[PDB]
CSV table of N, CA and C in Angstrom, one decimal:
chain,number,residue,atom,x,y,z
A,15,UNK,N,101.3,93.6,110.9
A,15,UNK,CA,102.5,94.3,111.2
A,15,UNK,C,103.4,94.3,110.0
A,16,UNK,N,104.7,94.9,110.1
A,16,UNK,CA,105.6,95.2,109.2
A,16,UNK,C,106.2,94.0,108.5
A,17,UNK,N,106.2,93.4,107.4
A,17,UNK,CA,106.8,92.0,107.3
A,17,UNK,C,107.7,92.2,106.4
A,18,UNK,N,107.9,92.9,105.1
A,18,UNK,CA,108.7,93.2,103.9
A,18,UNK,C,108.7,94.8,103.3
A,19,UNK,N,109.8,94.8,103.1
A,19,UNK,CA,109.9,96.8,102.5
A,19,UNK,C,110.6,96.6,101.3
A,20,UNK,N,110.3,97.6,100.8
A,20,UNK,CA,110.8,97.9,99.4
A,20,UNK,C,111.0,99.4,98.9
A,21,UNK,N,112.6,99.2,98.5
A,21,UNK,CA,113.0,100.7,97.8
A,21,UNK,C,113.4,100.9,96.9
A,22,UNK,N,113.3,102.2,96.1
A,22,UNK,CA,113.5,102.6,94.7
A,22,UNK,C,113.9,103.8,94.5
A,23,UNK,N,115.9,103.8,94.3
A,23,UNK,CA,116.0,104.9,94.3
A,23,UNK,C,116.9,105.5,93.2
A,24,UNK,N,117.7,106.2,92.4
A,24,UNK,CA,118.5,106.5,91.8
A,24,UNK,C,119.8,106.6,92.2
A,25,UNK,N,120.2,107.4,93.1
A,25,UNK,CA,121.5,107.2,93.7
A,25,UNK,C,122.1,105.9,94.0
A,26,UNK,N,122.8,105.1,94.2
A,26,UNK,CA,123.2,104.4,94.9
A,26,UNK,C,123.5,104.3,96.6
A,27,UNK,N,123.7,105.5,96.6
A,27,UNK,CA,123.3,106.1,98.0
A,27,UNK,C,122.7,106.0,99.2
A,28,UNK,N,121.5,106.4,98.1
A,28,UNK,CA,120.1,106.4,99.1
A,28,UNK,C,119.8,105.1,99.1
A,29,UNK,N,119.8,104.1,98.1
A,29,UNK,CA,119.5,102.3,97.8
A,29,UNK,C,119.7,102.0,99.1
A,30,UNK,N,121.2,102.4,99.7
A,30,UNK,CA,122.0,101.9,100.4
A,30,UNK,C,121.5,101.9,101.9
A,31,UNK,N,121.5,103.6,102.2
A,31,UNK,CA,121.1,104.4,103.3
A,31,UNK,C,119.7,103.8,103.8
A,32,UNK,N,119.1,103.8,102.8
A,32,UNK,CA,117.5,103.5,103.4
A,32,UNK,C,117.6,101.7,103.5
A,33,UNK,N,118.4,101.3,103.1
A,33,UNK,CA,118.1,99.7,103.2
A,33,UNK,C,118.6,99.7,104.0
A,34,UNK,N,119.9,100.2,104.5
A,34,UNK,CA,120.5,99.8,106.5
A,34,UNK,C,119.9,100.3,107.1
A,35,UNK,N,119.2,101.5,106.7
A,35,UNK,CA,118.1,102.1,107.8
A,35,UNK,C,117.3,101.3,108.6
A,36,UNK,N,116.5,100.5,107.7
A,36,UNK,CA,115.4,99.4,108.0
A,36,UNK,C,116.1,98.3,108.4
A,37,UNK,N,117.3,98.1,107.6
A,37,UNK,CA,117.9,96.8,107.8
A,37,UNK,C,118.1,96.4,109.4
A,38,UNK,N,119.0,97.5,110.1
A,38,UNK,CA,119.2,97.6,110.8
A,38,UNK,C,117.9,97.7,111.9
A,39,UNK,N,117.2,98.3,111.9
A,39,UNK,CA,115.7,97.8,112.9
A,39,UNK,C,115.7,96.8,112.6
A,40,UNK,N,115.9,95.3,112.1
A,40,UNK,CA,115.4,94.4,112.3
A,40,UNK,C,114.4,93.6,110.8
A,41,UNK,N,113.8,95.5,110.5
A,41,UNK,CA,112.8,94.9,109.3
A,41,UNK,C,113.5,94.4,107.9
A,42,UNK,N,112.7,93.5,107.2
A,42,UNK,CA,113.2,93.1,105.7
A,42,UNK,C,113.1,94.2,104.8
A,43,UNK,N,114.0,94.9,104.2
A,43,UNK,CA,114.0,95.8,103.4
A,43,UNK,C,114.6,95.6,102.3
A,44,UNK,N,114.2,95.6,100.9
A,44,UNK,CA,115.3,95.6,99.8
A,44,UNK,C,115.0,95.9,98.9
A,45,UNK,N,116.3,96.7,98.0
A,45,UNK,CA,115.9,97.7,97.0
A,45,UNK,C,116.1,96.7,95.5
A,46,UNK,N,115.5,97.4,94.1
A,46,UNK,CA,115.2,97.1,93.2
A,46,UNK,C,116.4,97.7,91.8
A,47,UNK,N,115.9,97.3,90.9
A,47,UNK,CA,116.8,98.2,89.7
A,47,UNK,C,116.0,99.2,89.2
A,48,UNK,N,114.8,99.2,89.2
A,48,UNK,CA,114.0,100.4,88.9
A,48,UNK,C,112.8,100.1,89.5
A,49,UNK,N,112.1,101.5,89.6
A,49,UNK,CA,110.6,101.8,90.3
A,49,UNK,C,109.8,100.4,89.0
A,50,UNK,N,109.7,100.2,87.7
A,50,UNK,CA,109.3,99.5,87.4
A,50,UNK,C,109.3,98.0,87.6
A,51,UNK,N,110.2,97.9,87.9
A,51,UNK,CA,110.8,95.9,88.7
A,51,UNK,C,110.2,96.4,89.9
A,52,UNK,N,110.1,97.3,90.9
A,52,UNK,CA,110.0,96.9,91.9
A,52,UNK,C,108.5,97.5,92.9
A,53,UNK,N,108.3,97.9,91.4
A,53,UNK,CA,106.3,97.8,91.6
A,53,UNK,C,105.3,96.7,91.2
A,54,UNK,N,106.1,96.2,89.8
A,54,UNK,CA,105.6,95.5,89.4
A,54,UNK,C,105.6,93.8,90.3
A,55,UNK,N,106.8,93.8,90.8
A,55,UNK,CA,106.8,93.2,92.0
A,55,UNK,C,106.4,93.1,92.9
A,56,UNK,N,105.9,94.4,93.6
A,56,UNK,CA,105.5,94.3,94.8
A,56,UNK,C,104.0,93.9,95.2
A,57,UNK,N,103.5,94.2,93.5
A,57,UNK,CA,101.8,93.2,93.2
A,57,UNK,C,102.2,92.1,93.8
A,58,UNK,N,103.2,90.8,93.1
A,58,UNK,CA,102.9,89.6,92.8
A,58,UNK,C,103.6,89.2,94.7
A,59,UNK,N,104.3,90.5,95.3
A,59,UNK,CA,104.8,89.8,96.8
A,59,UNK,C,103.8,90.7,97.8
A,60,UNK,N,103.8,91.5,97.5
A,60,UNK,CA,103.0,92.6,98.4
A,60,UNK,C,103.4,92.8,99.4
A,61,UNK,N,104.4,93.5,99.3
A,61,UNK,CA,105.3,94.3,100.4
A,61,UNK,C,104.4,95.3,101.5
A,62,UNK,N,105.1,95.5,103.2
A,62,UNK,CA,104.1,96.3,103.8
A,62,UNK,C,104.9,97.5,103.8
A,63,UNK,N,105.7,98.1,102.7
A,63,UNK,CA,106.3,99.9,103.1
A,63,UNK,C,106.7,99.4,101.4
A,64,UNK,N,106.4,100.4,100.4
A,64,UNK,CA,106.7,100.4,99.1
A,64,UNK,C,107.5,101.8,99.0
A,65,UNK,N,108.5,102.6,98.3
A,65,UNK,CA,108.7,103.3,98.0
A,65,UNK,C,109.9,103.7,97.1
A,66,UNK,N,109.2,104.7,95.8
A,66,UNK,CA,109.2,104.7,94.5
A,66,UNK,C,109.8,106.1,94.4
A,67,UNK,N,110.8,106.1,92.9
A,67,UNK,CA,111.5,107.8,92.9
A,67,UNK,C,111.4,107.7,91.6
A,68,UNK,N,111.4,109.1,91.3
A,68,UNK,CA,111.4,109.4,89.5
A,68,UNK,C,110.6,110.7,89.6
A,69,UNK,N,110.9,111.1,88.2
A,69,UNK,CA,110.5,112.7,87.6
A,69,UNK,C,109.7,112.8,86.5
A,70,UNK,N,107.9,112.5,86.8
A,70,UNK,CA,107.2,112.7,85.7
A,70,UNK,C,107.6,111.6,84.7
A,71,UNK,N,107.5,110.4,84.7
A,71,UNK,CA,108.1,109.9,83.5
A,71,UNK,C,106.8,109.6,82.5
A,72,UNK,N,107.3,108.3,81.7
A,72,UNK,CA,106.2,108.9,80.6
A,72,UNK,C,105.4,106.5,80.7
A,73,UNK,N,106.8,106.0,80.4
A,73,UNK,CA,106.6,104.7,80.3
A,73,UNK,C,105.7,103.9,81.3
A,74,UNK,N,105.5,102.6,81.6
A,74,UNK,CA,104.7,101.8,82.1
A,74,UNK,C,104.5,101.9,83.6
A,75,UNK,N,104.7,101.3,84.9
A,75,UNK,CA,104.8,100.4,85.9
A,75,UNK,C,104.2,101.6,86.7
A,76,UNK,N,104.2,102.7,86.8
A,76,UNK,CA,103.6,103.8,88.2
A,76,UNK,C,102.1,103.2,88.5
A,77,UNK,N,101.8,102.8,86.9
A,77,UNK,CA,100.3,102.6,86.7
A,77,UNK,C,99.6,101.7,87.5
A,78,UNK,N,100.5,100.9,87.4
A,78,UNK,CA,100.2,99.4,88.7
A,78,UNK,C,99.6,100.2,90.2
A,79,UNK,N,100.2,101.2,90.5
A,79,UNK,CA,99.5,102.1,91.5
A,79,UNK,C,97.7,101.9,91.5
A,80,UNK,N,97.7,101.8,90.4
A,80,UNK,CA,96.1,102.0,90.2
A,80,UNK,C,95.4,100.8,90.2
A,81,UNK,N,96.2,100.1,89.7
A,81,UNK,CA,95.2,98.5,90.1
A,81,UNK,C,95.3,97.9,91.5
A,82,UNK,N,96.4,98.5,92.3
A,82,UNK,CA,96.9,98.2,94.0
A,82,UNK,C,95.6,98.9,94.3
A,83,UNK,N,95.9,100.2,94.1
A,83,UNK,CA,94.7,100.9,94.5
A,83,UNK,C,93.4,100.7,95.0
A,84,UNK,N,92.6,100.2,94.1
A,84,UNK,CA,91.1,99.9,93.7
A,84,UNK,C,91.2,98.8,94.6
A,85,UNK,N,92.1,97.5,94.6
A,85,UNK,CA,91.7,96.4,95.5
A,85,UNK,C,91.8,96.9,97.0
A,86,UNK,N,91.1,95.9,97.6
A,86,UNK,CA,91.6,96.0,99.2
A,86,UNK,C,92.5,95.2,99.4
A,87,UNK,N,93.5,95.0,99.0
A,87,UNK,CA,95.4,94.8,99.6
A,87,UNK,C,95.9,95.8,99.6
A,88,UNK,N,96.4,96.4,98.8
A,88,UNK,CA,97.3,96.9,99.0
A,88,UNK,C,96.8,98.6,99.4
A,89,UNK,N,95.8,98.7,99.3
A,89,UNK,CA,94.7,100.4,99.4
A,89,UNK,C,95.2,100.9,100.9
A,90,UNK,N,95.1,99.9,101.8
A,90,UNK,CA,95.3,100.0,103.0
A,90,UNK,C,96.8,100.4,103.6
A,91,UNK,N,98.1,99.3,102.6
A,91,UNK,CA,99.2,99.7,102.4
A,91,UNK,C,99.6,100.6,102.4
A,92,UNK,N,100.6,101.4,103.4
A,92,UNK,CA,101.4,102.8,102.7
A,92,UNK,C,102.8,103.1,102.0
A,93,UNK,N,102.0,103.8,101.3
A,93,UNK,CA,103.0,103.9,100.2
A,93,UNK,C,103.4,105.2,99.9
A,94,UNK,N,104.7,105.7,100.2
A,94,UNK,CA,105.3,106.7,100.0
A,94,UNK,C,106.7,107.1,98.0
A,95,UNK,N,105.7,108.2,97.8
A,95,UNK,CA,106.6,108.2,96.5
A,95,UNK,C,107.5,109.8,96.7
A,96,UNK,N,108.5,109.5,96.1
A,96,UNK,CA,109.5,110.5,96.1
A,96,UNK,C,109.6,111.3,95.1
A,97,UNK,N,110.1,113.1,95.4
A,97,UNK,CA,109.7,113.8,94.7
A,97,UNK,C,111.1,114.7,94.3
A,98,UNK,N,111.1,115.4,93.3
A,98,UNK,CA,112.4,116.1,92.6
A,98,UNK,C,112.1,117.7,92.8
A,99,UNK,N,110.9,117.5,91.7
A,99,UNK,CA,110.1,119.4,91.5
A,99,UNK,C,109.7,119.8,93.0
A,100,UNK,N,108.9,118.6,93.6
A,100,UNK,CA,108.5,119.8,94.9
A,100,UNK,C,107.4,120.6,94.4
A,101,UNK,N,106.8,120.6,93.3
A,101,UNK,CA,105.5,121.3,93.1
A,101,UNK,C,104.0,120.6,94.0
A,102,UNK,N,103.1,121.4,93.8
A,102,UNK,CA,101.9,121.1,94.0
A,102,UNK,C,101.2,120.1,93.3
A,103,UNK,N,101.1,120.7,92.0
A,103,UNK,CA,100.2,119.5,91.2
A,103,UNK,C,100.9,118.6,90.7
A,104,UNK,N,102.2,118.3,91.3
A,104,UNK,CA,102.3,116.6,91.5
A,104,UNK,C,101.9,116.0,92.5
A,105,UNK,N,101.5,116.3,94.0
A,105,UNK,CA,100.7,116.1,94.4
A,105,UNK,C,99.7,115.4,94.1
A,106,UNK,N,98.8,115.8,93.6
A,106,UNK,CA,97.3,115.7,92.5
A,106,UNK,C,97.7,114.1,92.4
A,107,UNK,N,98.7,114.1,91.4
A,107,UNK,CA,99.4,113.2,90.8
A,107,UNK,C,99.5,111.8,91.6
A,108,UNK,N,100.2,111.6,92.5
A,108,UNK,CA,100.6,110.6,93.7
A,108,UNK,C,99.4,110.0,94.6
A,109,UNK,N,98.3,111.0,94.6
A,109,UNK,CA,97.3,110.8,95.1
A,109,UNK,C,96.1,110.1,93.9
A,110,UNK,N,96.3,110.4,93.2
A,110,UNK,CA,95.3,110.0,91.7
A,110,UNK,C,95.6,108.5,91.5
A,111,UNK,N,97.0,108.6,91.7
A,111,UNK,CA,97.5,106.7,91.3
A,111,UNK,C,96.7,106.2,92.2
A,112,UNK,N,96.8,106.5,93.8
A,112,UNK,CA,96.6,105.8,94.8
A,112,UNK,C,97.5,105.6,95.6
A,113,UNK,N,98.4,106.3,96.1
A,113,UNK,CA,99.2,106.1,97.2
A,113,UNK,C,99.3,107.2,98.0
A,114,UNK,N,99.6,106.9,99.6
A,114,UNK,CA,99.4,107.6,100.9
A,114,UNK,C,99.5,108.7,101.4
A,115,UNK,N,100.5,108.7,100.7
A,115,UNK,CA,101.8,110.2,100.9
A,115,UNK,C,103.3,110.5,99.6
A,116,UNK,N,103.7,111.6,100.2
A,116,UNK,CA,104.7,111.4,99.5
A,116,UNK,C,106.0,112.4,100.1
A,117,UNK,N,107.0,112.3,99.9
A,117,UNK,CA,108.2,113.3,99.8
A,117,UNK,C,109.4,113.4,99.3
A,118,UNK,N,110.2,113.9,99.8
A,118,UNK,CA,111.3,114.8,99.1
A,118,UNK,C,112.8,113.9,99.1
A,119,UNK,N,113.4,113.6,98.0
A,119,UNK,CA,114.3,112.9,98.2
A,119,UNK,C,116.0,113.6,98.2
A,120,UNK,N,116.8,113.9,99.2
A,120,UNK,CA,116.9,112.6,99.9
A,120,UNK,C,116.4,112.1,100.6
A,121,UNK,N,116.0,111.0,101.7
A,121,UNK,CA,115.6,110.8,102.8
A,121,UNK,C,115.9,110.5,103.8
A,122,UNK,N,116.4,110.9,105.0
A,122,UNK,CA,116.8,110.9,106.5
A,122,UNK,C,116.3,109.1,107.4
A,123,UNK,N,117.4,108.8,107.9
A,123,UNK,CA,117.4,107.9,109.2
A,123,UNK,C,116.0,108.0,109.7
A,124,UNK,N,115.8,109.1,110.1
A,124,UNK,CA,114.9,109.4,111.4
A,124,UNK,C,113.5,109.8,111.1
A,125,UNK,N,113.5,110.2,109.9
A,125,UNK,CA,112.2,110.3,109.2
A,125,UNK,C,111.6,109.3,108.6
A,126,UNK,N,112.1,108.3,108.1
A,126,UNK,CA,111.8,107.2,107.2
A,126,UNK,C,111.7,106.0,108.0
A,127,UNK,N,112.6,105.6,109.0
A,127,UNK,CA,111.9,104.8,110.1
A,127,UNK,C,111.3,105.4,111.3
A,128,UNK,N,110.8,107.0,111.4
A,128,UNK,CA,109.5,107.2,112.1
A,128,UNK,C,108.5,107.1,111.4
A,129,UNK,N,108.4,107.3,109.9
A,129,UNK,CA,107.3,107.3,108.8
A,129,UNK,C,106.6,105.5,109.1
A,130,UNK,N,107.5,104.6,109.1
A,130,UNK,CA,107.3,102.9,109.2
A,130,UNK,C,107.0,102.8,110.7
A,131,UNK,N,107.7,103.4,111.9
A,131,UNK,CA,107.5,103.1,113.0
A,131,UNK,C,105.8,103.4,113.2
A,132,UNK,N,105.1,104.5,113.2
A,132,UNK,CA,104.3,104.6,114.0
A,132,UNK,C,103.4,103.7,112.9
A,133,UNK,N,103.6,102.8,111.7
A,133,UNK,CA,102.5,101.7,110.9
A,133,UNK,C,102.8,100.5,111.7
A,134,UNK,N,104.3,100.1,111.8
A,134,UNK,CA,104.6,99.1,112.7
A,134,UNK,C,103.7,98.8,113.9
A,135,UNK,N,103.7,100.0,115.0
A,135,UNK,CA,102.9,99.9,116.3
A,135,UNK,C,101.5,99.8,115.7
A,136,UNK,N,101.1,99.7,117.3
A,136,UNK,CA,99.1,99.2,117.4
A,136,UNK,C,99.0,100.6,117.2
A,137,UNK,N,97.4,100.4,117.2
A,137,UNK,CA,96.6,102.0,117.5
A,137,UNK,C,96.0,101.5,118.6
A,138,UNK,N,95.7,102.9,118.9
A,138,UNK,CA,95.1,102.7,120.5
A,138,UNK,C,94.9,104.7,120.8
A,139,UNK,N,93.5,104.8,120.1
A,139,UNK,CA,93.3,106.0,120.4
A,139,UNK,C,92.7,106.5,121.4
């Protein structure tokens, strides 16, 4: 089940919004100073909800996506990344690193703890 979250955002805002979001359920949620600190962290703690914002950049830490990836830890993990353009072939992109899904930032109450809620619950098809 859900044990630790992690967010990464630009606004101060959204840092804010989405950490009482979760806060408030109950779950441990807490944000970083950059997608870099707080990917590269999320290897060494391995958080169960990761999520990362930025525009195409160029420097290090997205890459760590790809060594989570390949193992069976974190592959299983979902991981949602946040997007600006809204194009297609960033798409491509988010899925190539290795992570789950992705969307549009800002992000809503009710979307972001239904996105966690239904990982939280059992399955039972």
């Amino acid at each position: 089940m859900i044990r630790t979250i992690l967010a990464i955002d630009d606004s101060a805002t959204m840092r804010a919004l989405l950490h009482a979001t979760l806060a408030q359920a109950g779950y441990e949620v807490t944000v970083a100073a950059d997608g870099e600190a707080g990917f590269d962290l999320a290897a060494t703690t391995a958080y169960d909800l990761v999520l990362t914002d930025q525009n195409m950049p160029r420097k290090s830490g997205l890459e760590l996506i790809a060594a989570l990836r390949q193992l069976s830890a974190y592959a299983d993990t979902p991981i949602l990344v946040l997007t600006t353009e809204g194009s297609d072939a960033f798409k491509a992109a988010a899925r190539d690193a290795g992570a789950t899904g992705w969307i549009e930032k800002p992000i809503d109450p009710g979307v972001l703890v239904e996105l966690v809620a239904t990982l939280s619950e059992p399955a039972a098809n």
